[PDB]
Amino acid sequence: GSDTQLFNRAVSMVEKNKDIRSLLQCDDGITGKERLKAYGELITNDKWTRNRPIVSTKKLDKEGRTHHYMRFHVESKKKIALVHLEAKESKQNYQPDFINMYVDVPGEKRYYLIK
């Protein structure tokens, strides 16, 4: 499903961001590097073989522009983070455009990635 990839690329840029890497106290050395993984919301299985699919939202503005909203959680070796982002379609049936992207980490201050 294309919706899943939408969150995959969003979490990838968020987990590789050095700014957020400091909040999760991640690391990166020749002896061992930290790796982060994320998923939609509540879950209790593995892969897509049998679990809850990711849900997506679509809304049009006064101009008729449809916007998409996707939110998911991320689990690191030190804690779990929440990523929320907003995207809008440009022209028509084209690549989604993100306008707002930020994360919330427990014990740390919320950090925006786009804004």
Side-chain angles (χ1 to χ4, degrees):
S2 304
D3 47 81
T4 293
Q5 297 164 39
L6 226 115
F7 125 62
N8 279 330
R9 60 117 255 159
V11 104
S12 186
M13 60 177 280
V14 166
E15 72 187 42
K16 70 140 245 95
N17 182 322
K18 56 219 219 217
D19 300 58
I20 304 314
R21 159 190 84 201
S22 106
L23 310 195
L24 257 294
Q25 315 182 78
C26 273
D27 246 322
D28 255 340
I30 174 154
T31 185
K33 293 117 284 205
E34 184 60 65
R35 200 233 228 188
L36 296 155
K37 230 232 142 144
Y39 34 57
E41 313 179 61
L42 252 114
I43 45 117
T44 177
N45 230 76
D46 225 46
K47 244 121 208 161
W48 58 66
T49 57
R50 206 214 250 187
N51 45 282
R52 236 254 172 171
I54 294 302
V55 68
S56 23
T57 18
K58 72 215 305 90
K59 236 121 55 121
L60 53 132
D61 223 54
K62 169 240 197 176
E63 289 109 275
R65 214 194 205 160
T66 288
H67 297 144
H68 199 133
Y69 310 107
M70 209 142 219
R71 61 206 171 78
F72 34 99
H73 288 247
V74 184
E75 231 183 75
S76 315
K77 256 303 230 69
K78 264 117 244 249
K79 232 182 276 242
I80 312 110
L82 165 59
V83 178
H84 214 252
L85 73 95
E86 208 212 308
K88 47 150 248 209
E89 70 88 1
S90 223
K91 222 247 104 125
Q92 161 163 46
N93 185 70
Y94 221 62
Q95 64 229 1
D97 282 341
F98 303 102
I99 3 184
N100 301 110
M101 231 243 141
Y102 60 77
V103 186
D104 176 282
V105 279
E108 271 134 43
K109 274 244 144 170
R110 278 159 211 184
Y111 209 130
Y112 278 79
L113 240 97
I114 286 184
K115 205 260 228 246

